[PDB]
Amino acid sequence: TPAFNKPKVELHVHLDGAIKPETILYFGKKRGIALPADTVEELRNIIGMDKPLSLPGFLAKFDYYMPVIAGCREAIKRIAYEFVEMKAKEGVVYVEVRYSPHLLANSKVDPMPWNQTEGDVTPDDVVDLVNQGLQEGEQAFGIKVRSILCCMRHQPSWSLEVLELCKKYNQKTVVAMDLAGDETIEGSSLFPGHVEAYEGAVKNGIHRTVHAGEVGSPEVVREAVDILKTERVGHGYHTIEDEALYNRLLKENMHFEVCPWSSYLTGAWDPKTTHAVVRFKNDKANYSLNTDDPLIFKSTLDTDYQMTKKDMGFTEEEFKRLNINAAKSSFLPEEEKKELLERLYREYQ
């Protein structure tokens, strides 16, 4: 009984937010770095979330383990290879992982992250490491996996570099650019750095996706679509507040990377109101189901499917339909995208 026992497509999930508590414990002791706990169980209760907190409160959880990974090549390549394994077990045939290359490096990064000590793992180096562990997992488990480099809202100076990384690793797993981080930061979507990086992505052919509407107003989503020129909208739950902007995005067939369990734990979705995804399922909108950060939300792709099934009354037909759309909205090249749609239709028969 796993809600939807059929191939799936995940377009929204962060690598640094989907690491096995066991691997975190392994590198914590191997490098001698402190950890909130010394047990996979207790470490799960410290990093994991039980009740709804907030976007700034959920983002702090990363501080507990990111230092144990960042800086180590062996750890960056391993978490990428294990990520594929996880997705292969959940029944996901195609996936798009996203992460901030700068948050995992300890060299050539202005504001050094996690108070690290200068080393040699450059940002361009973490993109290559992740490409290797992701490619190895593809041959060992049998699933297609592409990546997405993120732009941190609070750090616009890194953006232009994220764009160059997308151009250099184009198709070599990297298929797009994203803007994640603290959406509560006022005007973080208009910071010249971000705006310039997305302007170059539009003229260079780099795909785009922007975290918006998760906790901000409809104006933020409007800026990601009009000024940043996104091809997708991470979350976008608050878009319905602006009837005009929502119906316009509904006509343009804008994709909405939805994350149900995540919106409840971050406060992005008030539990006393109907979830936006319900309105999406009713309006036949383009959207996909995702996990966002399984490690911190103590969840699995099935969690979200079981949440929409029991609550919100989602049917298998809707599951096959929202997955066919995710495959159509994926940043795969035409040929590969056709192959994906050919496989799903064959398995959905």
Ligand SMILES: OC[C@H]1O[C@@H](N2CNc3c(O)ncnc32)[C@H](O)[C@@H]1O
């Ligand atoms: O994975 C890249 C970065 O994006 C941020 N993430 C993760 N999850 C997440 C959420 O969906 N909303 C906004 N930003 C997010 C984390 O800060 C992480 O370090």
Ligand SMILES: [Zn+2]
């Ligand atoms: Zn996200």
